[PDB]
Design a protein around this ligand. Structure first.
Ligand code: NA
Length: 471
């Protein structure tokens, strides 16, 4: 009865977006979607009390995940998203008073969201259940369903290129273009490279997408939905009431609590404390040139801050509590900043206002450079690469080789859930992700590690329906 009117179907479309903001704290797990890939690359450690604190993260990082000790929150969030998208398509088949223009717009949002949620399970697990109404496909078969759905959304021709202040967070054409380029490039689907390049060029031609001149302004609260932002997942502290017992409410994010220094003295250098997950590797700080603005915007030297403080006051000496894999560096982009939870009305730990940046225009420029270099089309790959390189303060221009473009991504997107997928899709993962001199990673990546083990509870529930990955 209820989901028969346009007004109520709009409420269902809004509901289909909610699982976007769940995985950082949902289904009694912390599975923040960016960190779940970055812990498997070469930029961060895992941290916590020990290798048994969030053990599933430590196992994934060392390519020894097991089905009975695996992340499961993200899986449940992805399929909750898929189910809510399917509900809207079902409701539209039984719709009283929905105009043709509105039907197509509602459809464009939920089909694009559905591909976005399938992309989470496609990337992490590959060979997973598929449904468009409320069965295990191969990764290659799921790619086929995903890319065809994006083609249909693009062909509806109803999404705006950019949203306005009232609706930031809604699906846009630019968001769909970026998701299209993402899955096309991860699949190595050279048949679609020229189309993906044409889409990147359309975003580049828009005067309403560009680089922020100062990379240090991006991850500030004032940098949310800037000229650089193509897509973010919205989080707020203002009267936010996300809680241990209320993880699903539209509130703040847990991410800053997870990755800020344990028992930091709150307010020192306008940073707050967290649980000491995902310290930034010393090697990440060292790979930057001194005049690369990304170095300090990525790597916050918490220990140097206290060393300075203690020199300037030998009376009032401070420390934080170093945890497993401590380096003295934390991920500045999503660090707990004094004031960024100040208006929350529940658990301070779960209500940070930091939006999760998904697609930034520097990714558009690097995607276009790489696609041009791979022979998708003619275009100024060198200009596109160096707009990003030079925005970071670097004076030397670099040639648009594949290695140079892949390394610029590496410098550009630490902690943003890009590097692991870039290593795998370019064939670099086997040679880069090898045992370290710390004894932290003790295994080498190999092609069997591309798809994680499916959770044992899902294998058990499918009654032989779900074939476990050979990981
Ligand atoms: Na532009």
């Amino acid at each position: 009865t209820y989901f028969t009117t346009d007004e109520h179907i709009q409420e269902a479309v809004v509901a289909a977006y909610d699982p976007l903001h769940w995985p950082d704290w949902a289904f009694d797990e912390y599975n923040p979607v960016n960190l779940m890939s970055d812990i498997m690359a070469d930029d961060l450690w895992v941290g916590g009390d020990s290798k048994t604190d969030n053990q599933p993260w430590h196992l994934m990082m060392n390519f020894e995940a097991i089905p009975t000790n695996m992340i499961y929150g993200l899986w449940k969030c992805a399929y909750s998203g898929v189910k809510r998208c399917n509900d809207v398509i079902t409701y539209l088949d039984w719709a009283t008073d929905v105009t043709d223009a509105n039907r197509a717009y509602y459809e464009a949002q939920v089909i694009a969201l559905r591909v976005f949620y399938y992309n989470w399970v496609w990337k992490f697990w590959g060979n997973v259940p598929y449904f468009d109404k409320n069965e295990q496909l191969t990764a290659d078969q799921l790619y086929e369903k995903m890319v065809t759905s994006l083609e249909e959304v693009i062909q509806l021709n109803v999404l705006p290129m950019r949203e306005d202040s009232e609706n930031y967070g809604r699906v846009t054409l630019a968001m769909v273009y970026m998701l299209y380029a993402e899955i096309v490039m991860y699949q190595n689907d050279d048949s679609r490279y020229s189309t993906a390049l044409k889409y990147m060029e359309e975003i580049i031609s828009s005067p309403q997408y560009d680089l922020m001149p100062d990379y240090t302004d991006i991850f500030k609260e004032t940098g949310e939905w800037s000229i650089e932002s193509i897509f973010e997942i919205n989080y707020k502290d203002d009267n936010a009431v996300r809680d241990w017992g209320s993880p699903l409410v539209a509130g703040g994010t847990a991410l800053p609590t997870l990755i800020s220094p344990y028992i930091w003295p709150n307010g020192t250098d306008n940073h707050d404390r967290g649980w000491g997950f995902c310290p930034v590797r010393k090697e990440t700080y060292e790979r930057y040139s001194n005049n690369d603005t990304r170095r300090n915007a990525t790597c916050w030297n918490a220990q140097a801050v206290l060393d300075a403080h203690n020199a300037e006051h030998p009376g009032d000496k401070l420390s934080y509590t170093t945890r497993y894999q401590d380096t003295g560096f934390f991920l500045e982009k999503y660090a707990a900043i004094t004031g960024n939870n100040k208006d929350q009305k529940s658990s301070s730990e779960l209500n940070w206002n930091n939006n999760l940046r998904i697609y930034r225009y520097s990714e558009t420029l690097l995607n276009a450079a790489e696609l041009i270099t791979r022979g998708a089309g003619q275009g100024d790959a060198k200009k596109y690469l160096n707009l990003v390189h030079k925005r970071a303060g670097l004076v030397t221009e670099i040639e648009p080789t594949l290695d140079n473009i892949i390394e610029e991504r590496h410098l550009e997107f630490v902690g943003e859930g890009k590097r692991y997928w870039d290593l795998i899709r370019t064939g670099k993962a086997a040679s880069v992700l090898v045992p370290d001199a710390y004894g932290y990673r003790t295994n080498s990546w190999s092609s069997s590690k591309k798809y994680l083990p499916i959770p044992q509870k899902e294998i058990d529930a499918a009654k032989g329906t779900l074939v476990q990955n050979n990981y």
